[PDB]
Ligand binder design. Structure first.
Ligand code: 0HO
Ligand code: 0HO
Lengths: 289, 275
């Protein structure tokens, strides 16, 4: 065990260090909560930390790691926002006791060798033109769960397809961890919080409200059935200046090889300039809404 | 409430949640959980894995028996009983794959080589079920035979690459009196094939002793012995480093062979020390 100073923020970069501290904590009965992040932390992340914190006897581990394997070549990786000074200040403000900030060399000492192969859901939606993306995400989340061995792991619903694939990973590999999905945190106008919102100029920021407006409109229209819901969202997106829709799809909650029944998820992805935004919402169809 | 566990008797569990609960409860009581994965049809080679697991102080031995569709019950169970194994884990296919084949493990490029030649997806299946069994049973140590050497290397890659907290223990191949590596396939060999099959081990041990004269003398001694046998179709005979990369100029390596006798595919491998 490296030093662990309770009541303050302990930062570990070595996987063996956080693994040893985590195990020692669990053996003294603390329940270890993991919040995996890519840093550039905002209130949507602090909502995950806060949910983890309110679990009785919890110690919270927040990982910060910009995982190269979920990024495609073509500039995305070098462009991802890195603000580590701010990130650690926020965690200290929140009373988090452990930040895990591994190096690429420590995570990938053998490059890409054994990896996770997701099911067919990973080839759709965000995965369509980024066919290796979710293999990257599931591989890193598997390693983070094995290093930290948390009791529960916390993800935002904003990246809903990712949350679903993570539940698949946990079920399919019999992982002994509870996956907690936490509702999206939104700006006062409805804009889903995201580290990539910083890339919208004032006009794009004004226009971006159309995603959440479209989704909320669709959720209320849905008393009138699926067609109405989808046509309401499309009309709102169509009225928004310079919002370029990539997909808008209504699916079952598990996103899967089941037809939509009464409860669904409506998902949108759109480009504003170069910035791609995602959002989604729970939908109840007809009698159900 | 934890399922029933009776110390000193064979406790059989078919439900993954049950063996998980019992393994967790036992480890908290000061036992060290040892896992021996098998596909049943047990022979002396499997009992040597059991015996290695049993000698760890505080051990409780978990033997899984599961025919992995992706890669006699009573008799197997009696053998485990006679060895004093306290837990057998006998899941159905449905209990292991309740959502079918969905998230799986993709091995590194080693899985494309050697055995991965005729069976390109074989090792994805083995690594997937191995990862699952490790997560269900969460053993301190997991035991595999050296006879499936490439499999063992790939397991060790799985464990390192996914940061798994288990010790992988490789146990030397158990052999018949004439050196033939034990395998349930040996029983299909007719008398002429069984007599010729001894060339695999004879070639390898000849090479291991010829290796004081260097790598080419070792390979040439092994080929000469295989060349002296009738009806032995050699699929490969390769000298690699101990992690199955390229053999270095000297130092430790491993020599692997595979051959077909009739319809039966046999494999064998041995440590080699170059010069
Ligand atoms: O930073 C996040 O929003 C985030 C969201 C999902 C993640 N999966 S692994 N690391 C992740 C980080
Ligand atoms: O029965 C065996 O010889 C055997 C050998 C290796 C295995 N990896 S998973 N299940 C396995 C079973």
């Amino acid at each position: 065990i490296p030093a662990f100073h309770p009541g303050e923020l302990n930062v570990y970069s070595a996987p063996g260090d956080v693994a040893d501290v985590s195990r020692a904590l669990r053996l003294t009965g603390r329940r270890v909560m993991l919040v995996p992040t890519m840093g550039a932390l905002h209130e949507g992340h602090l909502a995950l930390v806060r949910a983890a914190k309110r679990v009785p006897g919890s110690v919270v581990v927040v990982s910060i790691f910009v995982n190269p394997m979920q990024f495609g070549a073509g500039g995305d990786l070098d462009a991802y926002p890195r603000t580590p000074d701010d990130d650690l200040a926020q965690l200290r403000a929140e009373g988090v006791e452990i930040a895990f900030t591994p190096t690429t060399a420590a995570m990938y000492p053998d490059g890409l060798r054994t990896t996770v192969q997701p099911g067919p859901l990973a080839a759709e939606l965000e995965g369509g033109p980024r066919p290796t993306h979710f293999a990257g995400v599931l591989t890193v989340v598997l390693k983070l769960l094995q290093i930290v061995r948390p009791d529960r792991v916390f993800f935002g619903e904003k990246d809903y397809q990712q949350l679903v694939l993570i539940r698949q990973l946990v079920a399919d590999f019999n992982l002994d961890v509870a996956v907690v999905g936490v509702p999206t945190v939104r700006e006062a106008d409805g804009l889903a919080m995201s580290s990539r919102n910083r890339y919208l100029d004032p006009a794009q920021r004004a226009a971006a409200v159309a995603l959440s407006a479209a989704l909320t409109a669709a959720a209320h229209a849905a008393t009138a059935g699926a067609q109405a819901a989808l046509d309401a969202a499309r009309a709102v997106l169509d009225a928004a200046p310079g919002v370029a829709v990539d997909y808008l799809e209504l699916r079952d909650i598990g996103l899967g090889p089941m037809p939509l029944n009464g409860s669904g998820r409506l998902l949108v992805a759109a480009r504003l300039g170069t910035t791609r935004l995602l959002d989604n919402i729970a939908i109840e169809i007809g009698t159900f809404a």
